[PDB]
Amino acid sequence: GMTEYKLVVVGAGGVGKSALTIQLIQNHFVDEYDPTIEDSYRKQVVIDGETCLLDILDTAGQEEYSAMRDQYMRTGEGFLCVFAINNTKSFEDIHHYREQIKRVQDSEDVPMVLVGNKCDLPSRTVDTKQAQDLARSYGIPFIETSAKTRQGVDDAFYTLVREIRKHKEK
Numbered sequence: 001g002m003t004e005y006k007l008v009v010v011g012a013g014g015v016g017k018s019a020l021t022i023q024l025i026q027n028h029f030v031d032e033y034d035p036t037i038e039d040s041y042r043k044q045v046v047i048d049g050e051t052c053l054l055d056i057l058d059t060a061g062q063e064e065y066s067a068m069r070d071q072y073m074r075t076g077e078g079f080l081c082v083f084a085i086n087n088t089k090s091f092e093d094i095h096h097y098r099e100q101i102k103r104v105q106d107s108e109d110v111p112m113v114l115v116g117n118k119c120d121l122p123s124r125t126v127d128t129k130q131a132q133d134l135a136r137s138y139g140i141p142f143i144e145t146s147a148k149t150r151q152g153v154d155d156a157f158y159t160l161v162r163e164i165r166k167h168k169e170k
């Protein structure tokens with residue numbers, strides 16, 4: 001059967017996790033998507049000529065119990081850790097999301113990509129060097145994205161799949 005990559009999108013409210021996921025899946029930019037809604041998406045893609053399925057959980061950081069949330073956090077193969085380049089607080093929050101992933105995976109080596117979203121906006125308060133320095137500290141890729149323009153969106157998800165492939169061949 002076709003290989004499935006189970007991916008989880010995490011980060012502070014308002015960074016564009018839902019917009020990024022819908023851009024990947026539906027190829028349009030959504031201005032308004034309920035900040036409390038957590039849902040999974042499945043998409044067949046070709047990455048470096050490998051036809052595969054992306055099984056993505058768009059997390060919403062809500063209190064209410066979800067069996068699906070626990071399952072994706074436990075069995076997820078890769079995580080997008082998303083901040084917004086015009087939201088210093090969302091960048092300050094990244095370490096908390098990475099710590100949560102390491103604890104649920106019981107691993108120091110979980111495939112992850114650091115995503116700086118909203119790179120279409122001129123009011124950048126988190127610079128490339130700061131983001132590259134954090135990614136280097138974690139030993140993970142840094143990808144700049146815009147859910148609005150689609151800049152870097154395929155690159156973010158496809159880079160995470162390449163990190164998972166590397167982990168599986170370790």
Ligand SMILES: Nc1nc2c(ncn2[C@@H]2O[C@H](COP(=O)(O)OP(=O)(O)O)[C@@H](O)[C@H]2O)c(=O)[nH]1
Binds near residue numbers: 014016019117118148
């Ligand atoms: N300019 C810009 N706005 C964005 C981008 N991605 C998301 N947004 C906006 O940021 C707000 C929060 O996005 P959303 O996907 O709900 O964030 P989530 O809470 O992380 O799921 C919304 O008003 C979006 O339209 C982007 O790349 N550029």
Ligand SMILES: [Mg+2]
Binds near residue numbers: 017018034058059060
């Ligand atoms: Mg959302």
